[PDB]
Design an enzyme around this catalytic site. Structure first.
Site, PDB file in Angstrom:
ATOM      1  N   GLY A 176       0.191   1.455   1.420  1.00  0.00           N
ATOM      2  CA  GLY A 176       1.567   1.532   0.978  1.00  0.00           C
ATOM      3  C   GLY A 176       1.710   2.527  -0.154  1.00  0.00           C
ATOM      4  O   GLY A 176       2.424   2.276  -1.119  1.00  0.00           O
ATOM      5  N   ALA A 177       1.003   3.647  -0.034  1.00  0.00           N
ATOM      6  CA  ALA A 177       1.052   4.721  -1.023  1.00  0.00           C
ATOM      7  C   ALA A 177       0.843   4.241  -2.450  1.00  0.00           C
ATOM      8  O   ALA A 177       1.140   4.957  -3.384  1.00  0.00           O
ATOM      9  CB  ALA A 177       2.391   5.451  -0.916  1.00  0.00           C
ATOM     10  N   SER A 183      -4.800   3.427   4.744  1.00  0.00           N
ATOM     11  CA  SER A 183      -4.077   4.323   3.812  1.00  0.00           C
ATOM     12  C   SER A 183      -4.492   4.100   2.368  1.00  0.00           C
ATOM     13  O   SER A 183      -5.645   4.355   2.006  1.00  0.00           O
ATOM     14  CB  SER A 183      -2.570   4.132   3.926  1.00  0.00           C
ATOM     15  OG  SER A 183      -1.937   5.383   4.074  1.00  0.00           O
ATOM     16  N   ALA A 184      -3.571   3.647   1.523  1.00  0.00           N
ATOM     17  CA  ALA A 184      -3.949   3.373   0.138  1.00  0.00           C
ATOM     18  C   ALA A 184      -5.000   2.285   0.222  1.00  0.00           C
ATOM     19  O   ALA A 184      -5.871   2.168  -0.632  1.00  0.00           O
ATOM     20  CB  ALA A 184      -2.743   2.883  -0.688  1.00  0.00           C
ATOM     21  N   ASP A 194      -2.700  11.417  12.646  1.00  0.00           N
ATOM     22  CA  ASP A 194      -2.477  10.752  11.373  1.00  0.00           C
ATOM     23  C   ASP A 194      -1.370  11.428  10.551  1.00  0.00           C
ATOM     24  O   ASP A 194      -0.525  10.747   9.988  1.00  0.00           O
ATOM     25  CB  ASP A 194      -3.786  10.667  10.577  1.00  0.00           C
ATOM     26  CG  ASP A 194      -4.167   9.229  10.221  1.00  0.00           C
ATOM     27  OD1 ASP A 194      -5.327   8.955   9.909  1.00  0.00           O
ATOM     28  OD2 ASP A 194      -3.302   8.357  10.238  1.00  0.00           O
ATOM     29  N   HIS A 246       0.178   7.583  11.977  1.00  0.00           N
ATOM     30  CA  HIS A 246      -0.318   6.879  10.799  1.00  0.00           C
ATOM     31  C   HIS A 246       0.028   5.382  10.829  1.00  0.00           C
ATOM     32  O   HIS A 246       1.167   5.021  11.086  1.00  0.00           O
ATOM     33  CB  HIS A 246       0.280   7.491   9.543  1.00  0.00           C
ATOM     34  CG  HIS A 246      -0.372   7.033   8.290  1.00  0.00           C
ATOM     35  ND1 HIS A 246      -1.737   7.101   8.099  1.00  0.00           N
ATOM     36  CD2 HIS A 246       0.147   6.541   7.142  1.00  0.00           C
ATOM     37  CE1 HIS A 246      -2.025   6.675   6.882  1.00  0.00           C
ATOM     38  NE2 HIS A 246      -0.898   6.330   6.280  1.00  0.00           N
TER      39      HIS A 246
END
Length: 533
Positions: free
Chosen positions: A107-108, A194-195, A320, A435
């Site tokens: 979630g960045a 991701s994060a 991605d 992604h």
């Protein structure tokens, strides 16, 4: 079977036995177990005091205080360090010595939670499917995100990485308490996307985790991805300061003001723009982990020795970078919109800021060779996607795969490319996975809610869960309780091959050099280029 009441350092805790079929199989479900004291704004997580009697762990708890969808308002709470556990139970003896997988959502670094992804169907990080199908325990949990989790002055006034510490606290809590639940504490495997994958990567690299992690899995994100490290945090901490009234003159005066400022105001301080604008999105996520000489002792590229005995799986998705590309140059997805050469240069110009116009050419020089197979059609458009996929995920991952083998002792290393498609692509050749597409398969959604998926989706999911949980169990995706459709060969500098995950797993699934051409450009020449300031 059933666990009933279990003793944890903080005291007893009761979950919910959920009958799985009618012969006795079930799953014990604990939601809302605290692994750290309520949090104080911008302060490191502290141990949990404990409670008296029996904690009824039946409901998820609030996600950490974070910006809302519209960055309009905030939802959550600063008392969010809770975790949830899933334990597959059989028909007779309660389970014991089970590998333990701890999920770290992405979630960045701005939003998310242990139950995080959800709707009127069923939350996405539910670990029932992975637990029961792989015979492993699944832990999900919350960690501070956004300003509250990573605001930093770049020095001791405000070190940052509070979020990474939360992760640490929960992995440690699992280490000292997961035995009571039937888990093998010396076999904890971390996984995230991701994060989440960058976080899994960062935790394996931190000296704070000596002896805690046995294996790790990074899905589209490693500590080397360009968006992971905030090079100039102070700038950001000032932006927030202004917006909330604090003085931005003394690093130390503004830090104590921020610690007292309303947690909600700090969360809403900065707001990321609209959709199609000015620069690339990378240029916009700011509240992220920082190299603090403490939790992240130095640039992650020099910390791999710390992951020498941590088996590791790292991979990315076919397309991605698709969605990110589609925001920096909307043209990509419009069958009647043109993709300019000046455009793409303006873009690569942005991703190569710290390397001046020199580094902008070199990069532009490499990515442009298309003898215009499609000046503005199926080709140059896709190279925009591949530029985004390469910089944000592929290349950083390939550099981490190598760096991890080169430092290996007992650690095995494995790489993958997720290419199964869940949706019709724009162009018939851009078939693949975007992604985050991987999450729903790893979490067994095709089985969880069979009605929303195709038989092929179930097949991919069954395979991925088998690989991930054999890996959690033995350190070899090929070995464990689940059959796998095809042997997955360990990554080595030499072979340096990867497994391609699709609906038709076979022997040709094991591929090799993936664009070694750009990997080569980036690592051999761009990286050694003069950083202009």
């Amino acid at each position: 079977a059933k666990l009933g009441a279990v003793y944890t350092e903080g005291g007893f805790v009761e979950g919910v036995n959920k009958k799985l079929g009618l012969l006795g199989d079930s799953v014990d479900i604990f939601k809302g177990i605290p692994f750290a004291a309520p949090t104080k704004a911008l302060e490191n997580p502290q141990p949990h005091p404990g409670w008296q009697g029996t904690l009824k762990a039946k409901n998820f708890k609030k996600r950490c205080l974070q910006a809302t969808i519209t960055q309009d308002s905030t939802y959550g709470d600063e008392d969010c360090l809770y975790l949830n556990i899933w334990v597959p139970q059989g028909r007779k003896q309660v389970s014991r010595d089970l590998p333990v997988m701890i999920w770290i959502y992405g979630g960045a670094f701005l939003m998310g939670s242990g139950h995080g992804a959800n709707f009127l169907n069923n939350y996405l990080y539910d670990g029932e499917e992975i637990a029961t199908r792989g015979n492993v325990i699944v832990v999900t949990f919350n960690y501070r995100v956004g300003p509250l989790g990573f605001l930093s002055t770049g020095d001791a006034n405000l070190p940052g990485n509070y979020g990474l510490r939360d992760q640490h606290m929960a992995i440690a809590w699992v280490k000292r308490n997961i035995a009571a639940f039937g888990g093998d504490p010396d076999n904890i495997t971390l996984f995230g996307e991701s994060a989440g994958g960058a976080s899994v990567s960062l935790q394996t690299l931190s000296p704070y985790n000596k002896g805690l992690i046995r294996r790790a899995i990074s899905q589209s994100g490693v500590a080397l991805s360009p968006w992971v490290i905030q090079k100039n945090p102070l700038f950001w901490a000032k932006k927030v300061a202004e917006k909330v009234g604090c003085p931005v003159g003394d690093a130390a005066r503004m830090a104590q003001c921020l610690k007292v400022t309303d947690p909600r105001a700090l969360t809403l301080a900065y707001k990321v723009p609209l959709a199609g604008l000015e620069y690339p999105m990378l240029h916009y996520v700011g509240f992220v982990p920082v190299i603090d000489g403490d939790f992240i002792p130095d640039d992650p590229i020099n910390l791999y020795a710390n992951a020498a005995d941590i088996d590791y799986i790292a991979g990315t998705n076919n397309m991605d970078g698709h969605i990110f590309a589609s925001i920096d140059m909307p043209a990509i997805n419009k069958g009647n919109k043109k993709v300019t050469e000046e455009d793409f240069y303006k873009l690569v110009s942005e991703f190569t800021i710290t390397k001046g116009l020199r580094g902008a050419k070199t990069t532009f020089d490499v990515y442009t060779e298309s003898w215009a197979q499609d000046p503005s059609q199926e080709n140059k458009k896709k190279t925009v996607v591949d530029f985004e996929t390469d910089v944000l995920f592929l290349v950083p991952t390939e550099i981490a795969l190598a760096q991890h083998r080169a430092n290996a002792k007992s650690a095995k290393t494995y790489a993958y490319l997720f290419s199964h498609p869940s949706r019709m692509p724009v162009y018939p050749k851009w078939v693949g996975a975007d992604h985050a597409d991987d999450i729903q398969y790893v979490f067994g959604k095709p089985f969880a809610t069979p009605t929303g998926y195709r038989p092929q989706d179930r097949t991919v999911s069954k395979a991925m869960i088998a690989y991930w949980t054999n890996f959690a169990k033995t350190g070899d995706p090929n070995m464990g309780d689940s059959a796998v459709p095809t042997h997955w060969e360990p990554y080595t500098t030499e072979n340096s091959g990867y497994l391609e995950i699709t609906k038709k797993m076979g022997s040709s699934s094991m591929k090799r050099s993936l664009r070694t051409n750009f990997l080569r450009y980036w690592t051999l020449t761009y990286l050694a280029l003069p950083t202009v300031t």
